C-alpha cells in the first residue's frame with residue numbers, strides 16, 4: 571500500500587547526487603554543502619492528501635498534494651515547476667516539468683529501505699533512506 575512509505579526516514583547512502591545537481595545548474599558551493607547533508611524525509615497522509623517534508627541543516631522543504639492531481643511547486647533549488655505525484659508499479663513517482671524540461675523523483679521500498687531515484691536527462695542519482 572502507499573501506507574508503507576509513511577514515516578520518518580534518514581539518508582544512509584547516495585550515488586551521483588553531484589551529477590544530478592550539476593544537471594540542474596546548482597552552483598559548486600551549494601553542491602558541496604548539499605553533498606555532505608544527511609536529510610530526514612517525513613511522509614504523512616490525511617485522507618488522500620500526502621505531505622512530504624525534508625529537513626536538513628542546509629534547507630527544509632515541504633509539499634502537500636493529492637495523488638494524481640497536478641500542483642505548482644517551487645523546488646528546493648528554486649525552480650518553479652508543474653508537478654504531479656502518482657503511484658506507478660508500487661513506486662511514488664513525482665514528475666516536475668518546467669521550460670519543456672522534466673525530472674523525476676521516484677521512491678520505492680526494497681527490503682525495508684526507501685530508494686529515491688532522481689533522473690534529469692542523462693543524470694541518474696540513487697539515494698537510500700532507512701526508517702527512523
Ligand SMILES: COc1ccc2c(c1)c(CC(=O)O)c(C)n2C(=O)c1ccc(Cl)cc1
Nearest residue numbers: 596600604609624629645646647673688697
Ligand atoms: C529535484 O530534486 C532535488 C532537489 C534538491 C534536493 C534534492 C533533490 C535532495 C535529495 C533528497 O531528498 O535526498 C536534496 C537533499 N536537495 C536539497 O536539499 C537541495 C536544496 C537546494 C539546492 Cl539549491 C540543492 C539541493
